[PDB]
Design an enzyme around this catalytic site. Structure first.
Site, mmCIF file in Angstrom:
data_model
loop_
_atom_site.group_PDB
_atom_site.id
_atom_site.type_symbol
_atom_site.label_atom_id
_atom_site.label_comp_id
_atom_site.label_asym_id
_atom_site.label_seq_id
_atom_site.Cartn_x
_atom_site.Cartn_y
_atom_site.Cartn_z
ATOM 1 N N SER A 176 52.476 49.947 37.179
ATOM 2 C CA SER A 176 51.847 51.334 37.452
ATOM 3 C C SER A 176 51.422 51.286 39.019
ATOM 4 C CB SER A 176 50.990 50.686 36.441
ATOM 5 O OG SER A 176 50.550 52.629 36.247
ATOM 6 N N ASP B 97 58.590 48.307 17.844
ATOM 7 C CA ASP B 97 58.091 47.173 18.374
ATOM 8 C C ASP B 97 58.731 46.960 19.791
ATOM 9 O OD1 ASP B 97 56.151 45.787 19.356
ATOM 10 O OD2 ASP B 97 56.452 44.321 18.316
#
Length: 330
Positions: A199, A35
């Site tokens: 992004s 994770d």
């Protein structure tokens, strides 16, 4: 040193991935959910409330000659999906794919919430976010990667998750045969403890690319892709009959649909998520309404590039003095 381990989807939907981890002496092998959105290595154990164990493999520290109680240490964690667990702490030897750390904090669960009990395939979590998020008190502990870093050939790990198929976690090296083209690296903020990056935009299907900054986290422990409501609405508007369902908890679409791809930007590069990766199947057994793999982050407080996005790429978690993320197509 290096390590390399195969990671396997827990079910036919890729709801999560499990990676075998050796703990203790002699080794006890548990299948952990790696994770990158959390920083605790915790396991079902011989200390877990018996009624909360249902098929998981347990760690038994009393059977490990290298286990030592970390005296006074406790841990307690709550995840973004509302699940939680807590317990006490041992140190022990932990190996992943041939890479060994001695003295790793192994957080033994005394209690786990119902969603953990109900998932017999996941024996615990191995956190790979920054150690500043580790919950052990009163002495915060380091992640497996943080402990291994100085010994690694290069201070990196890579995630290569498969679509409906196994993939690989590598530590200490970048397998240049595992991706196509070049790796595009992008800046990371560690201020929230995550692999947080920006992004450069998105496209839906064959549509034109929209240049827009989307701050979010690379999180292997989250199944879906959670993005701003504007972006998510633009995606689902291209699917006839798709709608946001308050009763189901997100966007659903007719199971008869063919889904468009979704592209996200990494600098000037582009990662394409095929439409099929966005199908999470019937909302309930036999239903013709299917659950979408791109969902709004509006209720979270952060955008999450979870498995739906990451499995479309070869992803480098670069833990150099200034961390960065790399993405390549594959």
């Amino acid at each position: 040193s290096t390590g390399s381990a195969t990671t396997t989807p827990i079910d036919s939907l890729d709801d999560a991935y499990i990676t075998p981890v050796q703990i203790g002496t002699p080794a006890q092998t548990l299948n952990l959910d790696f994770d990158t959105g959390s920083s605790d290595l915790w396991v079902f154990s011989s200390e877990t409330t018996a009624s909360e164990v249902d098929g998981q493999t347990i760690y038994t520290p009393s059977k490990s000659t290298t286990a030592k109680l970390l005296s006074g240490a406790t841990w307690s964690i709550s995840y973004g999906d509302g699940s939680s667990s807590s317990g006490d702490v041992y140190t022990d030897t932990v190996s992943v794919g041939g890479l060994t750390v001695t003295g790793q904090a192994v957080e033994s669960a005394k209690k786990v919430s119902s969603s953990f009990t109900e998932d017999s395939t996941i024996d615990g979590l191995l956190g790979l976010a920054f150690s500043t998020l580790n919950t052990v008190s009163p002495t915060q502990q380091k992640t497996f990667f943080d402990n291994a870093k100085a010994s690694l050939d290069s201070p990196v790990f890579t995630a290569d998750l498969g679509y409906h198929a196994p993939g690989t976690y590598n530590f200490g090296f970048i397998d240049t045969t595992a991706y196509t083209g070049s790796i595009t690296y992008t800046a990371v903020s560690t201020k929230q403890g995550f692999w947080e990056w920006t992004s450069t935009g998105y496209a839906v299907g064959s549509g034109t690319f929209k240049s827009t900054s989307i701050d979010g986290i690379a999180d292997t422990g989250t199944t879906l892709l959670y993005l701003p409501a504007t972006v998510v609405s633009a995606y689902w508007a291209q699917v006839s009959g798709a709608k946001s369902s308050s009763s189901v908890g997100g966007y659903v679409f007719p199971c008869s649909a063919t889904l468009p791809s979704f592209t996200f930007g990494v600098g000037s590069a582009r990662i394409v998520i095929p439409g099929d990766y966005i199908d999470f199947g019937p909302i309930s057994t036999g239903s013709s309404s299917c659950f979408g793999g791109i969902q709004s982050s509006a209720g979270i407080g952060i955008n999450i590039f979870g498995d739906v996005a990451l499995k479309a790429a070869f992803v480098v978690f670069n833990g150099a003095t200034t961390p960065t993320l790399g993405f390549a197509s594959k």
